[PDB]
Amino acid sequence: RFLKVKNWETEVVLTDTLHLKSTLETGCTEYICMGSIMHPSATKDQLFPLAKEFIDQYYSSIKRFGSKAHMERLEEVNKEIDTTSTYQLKDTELIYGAKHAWRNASRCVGRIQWSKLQVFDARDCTTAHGMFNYICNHVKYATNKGNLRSAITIFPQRTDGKHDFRVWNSQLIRYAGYKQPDGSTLGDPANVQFTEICIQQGWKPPRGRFDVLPLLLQANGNDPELFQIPPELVLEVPIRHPKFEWFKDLGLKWYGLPAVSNMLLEIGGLEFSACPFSGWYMGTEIGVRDYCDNSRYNILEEVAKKMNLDMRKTSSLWKDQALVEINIAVLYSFQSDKVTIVDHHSATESFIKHMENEYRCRGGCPADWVWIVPPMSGSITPVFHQEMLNYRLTPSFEYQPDPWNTHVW
Amino acid sequence: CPRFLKVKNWETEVVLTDTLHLKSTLETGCTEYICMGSIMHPDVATKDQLFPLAKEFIDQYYSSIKRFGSKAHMERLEEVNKEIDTTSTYQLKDTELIYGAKHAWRNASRCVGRIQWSKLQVFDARDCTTAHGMFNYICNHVKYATNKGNLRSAITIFPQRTDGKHDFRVWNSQLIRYAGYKQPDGSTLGDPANVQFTEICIQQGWKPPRGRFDVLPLLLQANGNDPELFQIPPELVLEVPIRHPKFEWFKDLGLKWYGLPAVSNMLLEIGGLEFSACPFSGWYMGTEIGVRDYCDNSRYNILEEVAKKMNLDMRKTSSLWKDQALVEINIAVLYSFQSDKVTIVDHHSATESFIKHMENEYRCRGGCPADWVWIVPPMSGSITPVFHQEMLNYRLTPSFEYQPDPWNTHVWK
Ligand code: HEM
Ligand code: HEM
Ligand SMILES: CN(C)c1cccc(CNCc2ccc3ccc(N)nc3c2)c1
Ligand SMILES: CN(C)c1cccc(CNCc2ccc3ccc(N)nc3c2)c1
Ligand SMILES: C[C@H](O)[C@H](O)[C@H]1CNc2nc(N)[nH]c(=O)c2N1
Ligand SMILES: C[C@H](O)[C@H](O)[C@H]1CNc2nc(N)[nH]c(=O)c2N1
Ligand SMILES: [Zn+2]
């Protein structure tokens, strides 16, 4: 069942064989496509086949399939599940698994970097203070004074679901959001809820536009605890425009390190509920989504006024104009501060090249066109014209529910 | 399949509930293990295949006019059945034809303009027998729809397929398009998208002006005969010269586009009947011209030339010089059309209308199939409301379908 994907601009056709190695669902059926749905719908006996699957591909990946080492590992993992209802990955396997979860992440346009990932093993962590220490080291390592380095820190795997390690923040670094008396919103409205949970727990908010949230860390199923990231570890960039000297007066800033902390890493049937990972920003993430989404910072109107645009009718495309200038400013600011960032043209171009490598060496590359195509200037990037196949490979990063919906104190 | 599927809008938190997907009649191409949502494209029906297909449609029609189960309903069923049994096909009443065409549009998941679905002038050309007659019908379509700039959506429907060796076909992908010419040096003049078709017209006897914006002749096939060339009267072809409200130099690019987008190569399927020639037209969303026609690399590819005249730094991609030029080009397209009083809609207005449309459809029909990949405009996606709208895609009938290009299948006489 070979499948072709065509690029309609280059006329290049690639052939997908890798999709046959999928066992998990996408949500679509033969009659309904859920391609634009954000979130479409263990035990001993469940655990061994999954473990065996993963061990098999690991030893296949290192070109020693059926080897002496392979056979022993299967036997070892088998006995361990049998006696403990779970098992422990070797260090090599942990690293392999984390890199391959990134490699398999269909929504990520940054996967050309997949094999360059610093993996921090934190599976010996037992307390929230421990988690905080590991997270601080992660932030300091990955930030690297502006020359950002991809990293992931991995906390103890789930056991019975009652003793989960969770990073309650959705990212290690985010700005707080405050509901104002007049019903408006101060700061980042995405984090309004979380921000209030921090307030409720003892955090004293400066009530500003860009207040770095505290860490809320839960170890071994216990109540979460508050920690302030040492500010010298938090790299931030003042946004300015290279032509418009009034732009700095907007008072905008963003942090340099995007560090997603609320996903679940699944490897060989094992679940890692706390696995903050980080790379670096594509400019549009901040410039289009964080800044210009109606339900986020929502600055288009303000910027539009400073550029003195006619805002009476949509067909003047004043929004599109303002959107481009904002995104120029973000790239300029980060570059001028020697902080790693990628523009959407460069990123999408690297992704097409990555796709080509993957088809050539791996027989395909799962990819989610809905997420891959940038949220501005879509068809002037090469991925718009790229047919992609989406399918779920393991190891993977999965969504999990917010901890405050399932945690009793 | 579950009876209630929910879609969420991530900007407004509005949740809608779809039940209409249960009426889905054909395959998307996806399976449970793979999604083909970004794939562009993922001899006749026997008596027994035709019976349920026809009954399905007739039931739907009589349900729509609140006469389901009526004597007229059962009579129509019995008459259709007899007709299939004695002729292996059947003929649609004018009322059913009009309903079916409007519903094929209503069902078109890739169309952002469907709020207008129930306002569609249908021209019944099922009495057409020759290519000259097809030409007459098409000229009348163009003039009515153009309406001196005040465009009116319309479809003209030619006779349905019979044995498959007598198809009516418009060979043109749209009624109005510009020629493309491959040069000996590898460069292209005009629209690179139309090179192949242009070549065919030239072989058929067309004398090409060999310019940048040469309107192509119609290449019309009636009753399965070899196709024939016809020139559309130029006074019927409304065109807009592109200028920019600020940049005086923009008119010097010698750009223009035609006013009427009129897809002419799709197949219209109603109650199992196949109308292989059904040119239809609405009006343009600006980005269709300003982003795709003008800025695609494989199309007119003008970004560079515009950026140069704007004197942009074009060395660092991170200057976003492409993005900056793209916006100006789209501003010029909208300004030129509005100035010449030719109907056009910007992508903000269109997508906002589609959201209101989609909500109404979920309310009154239990759903609205939509293809997010197509519905989200090719620029500024995130700042239009559709980007944030979860959509369910599925294929309802009647529908517009793709069909192979006629020169690939035609048996030359
Ligand atoms: C190194 C530079 C990287 C770049 C430029 C990059 C780029 C992106 C972008 C732009 C998105 C879309 C996010 C959004 O729109 O909200 C994304 C998604 C994603 N990325 Fe990457 N990424 C990078 C590194 C990484 C790393 C190191 C990992 C994991 C180890 C990773 C895993 C993921 C996952 C799982 C998603 C899906 C997020 C979701 O479903 O919410 N990425 N990436
Ligand atoms: C009245 C104003 C209309 C507007 C603003 C509009 C808008 C659009 C746009 C922007 C597209 C995407 C085209 C592309 O990117 O190639 C599209 C596709 C489509 N439209 Fe509409 N449309 C209109 C009228 C109509 C009518 C009258 C019909 C049929 C009766 C129709 C049926 C379709 C179909 C079948 C597609 C899919 C085209 C394909 O798959 O190539 N539209 N429409
Ligand atoms: C609920 N959830 C999983 C969540 C939480 C925060 C943000 C998001 C959206 N995904 C954003 C994201 C993820 C990974 C990235 C890696 C690199 C990069 N530059 N940006 C990323 C953005 C979802
Ligand atoms: C079937 N095929 C290959 C084909 C032929 C011509 C054009 C296209 C792309 N679809 C363009 C289209 C379709 C309907 C429209 C309705 C209104 C409008 N303003 N634009 C439309 C563009 C594909
Ligand atoms: C409804 C739709 O799935 C949702 O808005 C998606 C669309 N594409 C996206 N693409 C990226 N990269 N990030 C996102 O958050 C989204 N949101
Ligand atoms: C690969 C991808 O499916 C292809 O480029 C699509 C994307 N979405 C589109 N959307 C519209 N409206 N028109 C198009 O031609 C396309 N092309
Ligand atoms: Zn799908």
Coordinates of C-alpha atoms and ligand atoms in Angstrom, one line a residue, chain A residues 28 33-35, chain B residues 30 34-37, ligand 7:
Chain A
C28 CA -10.6 10.1 10.7
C33 CA -11.9 13.7 8.0
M34 CA -11.0 15.2 11.4
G35 CA -7.8 16.8 10.0
Chain B
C30 CA -8.7 9.1 5.0
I34 CA -3.9 7.8 8.0
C35 CA -5.3 11.3 7.2
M36 CA -5.2 12.6 3.6
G37 CA -6.7 15.9 4.4
Ligands
ZN7 ZN -8.4 13.0 7.6

